[PDB]
């Protein structure tokens, strides 16, 4: 289970361990914790709200 998700909108980190990404970035999802997901993009890791992405099947 390494799910892939595409950013529907850009999101800027609120905290030091939040992920930064731009609209259309493809994020690798490592963990799902209800409304917050942990993942990786552009070599960086962090948390982000799942509402900002859509799973790529």
């Amino acid at each position: 289970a390494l799910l892939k998700a595409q950013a529907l909108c850009s999101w800027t980190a609120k905290k030091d361990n939040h992920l930064n990404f731009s609209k259309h970035d493809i994020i690798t999802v490592l963990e799902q914790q209800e409304n917050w997901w942990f993942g990786e993009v552009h070599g960086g890791r962090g948390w982000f709200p799942k509402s900002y992405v859509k799973i790529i099947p």
Binding site: K15, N17, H18, L30, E31, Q33, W36, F38, R45, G46, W47
Partner: peptide, 12 residues
């Protein structure tokens, strides 16, 4: 990855 501080700190 589950031992990274980024992960362990959690989203809040």
């Amino acid at each position: 990855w589950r031992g990274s501080l980024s992960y362990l700190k959690g989203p809040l």
